[PDB]
């Protein structure tokens, strides 16, 4: 079965802001997770064809991944930090919902989520 259109990363109808929290989400949060040895399954939208997951998009209706988040941050898609934090949490939750609890990919998400939670705990105050 086919992949859906990816989540949007560009929309001139959507109002945008550049804020110090969003800057931190790129410079600290995304960068920390992206360079991790376990980042690779999360660096692009789930490719149900390549990965032979024909039911993935039957089950997962709000897909999200760090490639999309990276584009949203680099291309100033967000208004606030909570939108971006929600995207990360959607990505993790999708992984835990779709995959079996003993899968390596769940351990990988868990390790990335541990770092995410630490960095979000230190989210800078709004300027």
Domain of residue 48 covers: 19-123
11 part of a folded domain: no
Reading the block at residue 6, the tokens are 């990816």
Sequence-separated (6 or more) residues with CB below 8 Å from residue 34: 43, 66, 70
Q: Is 52 left (phi over 0), alpha (psi -120 to 50) or beta?
A: left
Asked if 29 and 120 count as a contact pair (C-beta separation under 8 A), the reply is: yes
Dihedral of CA 107/59/5/53: which sign? positive
Cβ-in-10-Å burial (0-12, 13-18, 19+) of 68 comes to buried
Name the helix (H) or strand (E) containing 123. none
9 part of a folded domain: no
1 part of a folded domain: no
Asked if 7 and 45 count as a contact pair (C-beta separation under 8 A), the reply is: yes
Domain count within the chain: 1
What CA–CA distances, in Å, run from 52 to 1, 2, 34, 38, 55?
Answer: 9, 10, 24, 20, 9
Distance CA 97, CA 92 (A): 9
95 part of a folded domain: yes
Resolution value in angstroms: 1.5
Distance CA 105, CA 111 (A): 10
Work out the end-to-end distance of the chain between its first and last CA atoms, rounded to an integer number of angstroms: 46
7 part of a folded domain: no
């Amino acid at each position: 079965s086919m992949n859906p259109p990816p989540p949007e990363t560009s929309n001139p109808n959507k109002p945008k802001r550049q804020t110090n929290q969003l800057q931190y989400l790129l410079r600290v949060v995304l960068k920390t997770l992206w360079k991790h040895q376990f980042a690779w399954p999360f660096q692009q939208p789930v490719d149900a064809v390549k990965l032979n997951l024909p039911d993935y998009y039957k089950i997962i209706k709000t897909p999200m991944d760090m490639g999309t988040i990276k584009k949203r941050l680099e291309n100033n898609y967000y208004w606030n930090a909570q939108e971006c934090i929600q995207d990360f949490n959607t990505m993790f939750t999708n992984c835990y919902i779709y995959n079996k609890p003993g899968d390596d990919i769940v351990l990988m998400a868990e390790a990335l989520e541990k770092l995410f939670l630490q960095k979000i705990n230190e989210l800078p105050t709004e300027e």
